[PDB]
Design a protein around this ligand. Structure first.
Ligand code: BR
Ligand code: BR
Ligand code: BR
Ligand code: BR
Lengths: 16, 69
């Protein structure tokens, strides 16, 4: 839910 | 922190843009999960997201702000 959303955000925000 | 919040806002934008196509949102989520779990390189994720958002050029440009440099 907001879990899947926050999980994706954490991965996205650590690519740079 | 700010970057995390920007990522949360971006992923929410994807979720709502594809509110009637949840499979596309789900595919975006799995691209990121596969990237992490299989240690895929940035350029492969770039390729996958470019294809997924071919008809959403604004979402594609937003994605690129999270890439190195
Ligand atoms: Br979600
Ligand atoms: Br769908
Ligand atoms: Br993939
Ligand atoms: Br579409």
């Amino acid at each position: 839910l907001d879990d899947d959303l926050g999980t994706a955000a954490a991965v996205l925000s650590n690519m740079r | 922190d700010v970057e995390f919040s920007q990522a949360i806002s971006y992923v929410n934008k994807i979720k709502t843009r594809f509110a009637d196509q949840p499979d596309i949102y789900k595919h975006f989520l799995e691209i990121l999960q596969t990237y992490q779990r299989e240690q895929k390189p940035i350029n492969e994720v770039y390729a996958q997201v470019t294809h997924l958002f071919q008809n959403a050029p604004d979402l594609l440009e937003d994605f690129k702000k999270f890439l190195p440099d």
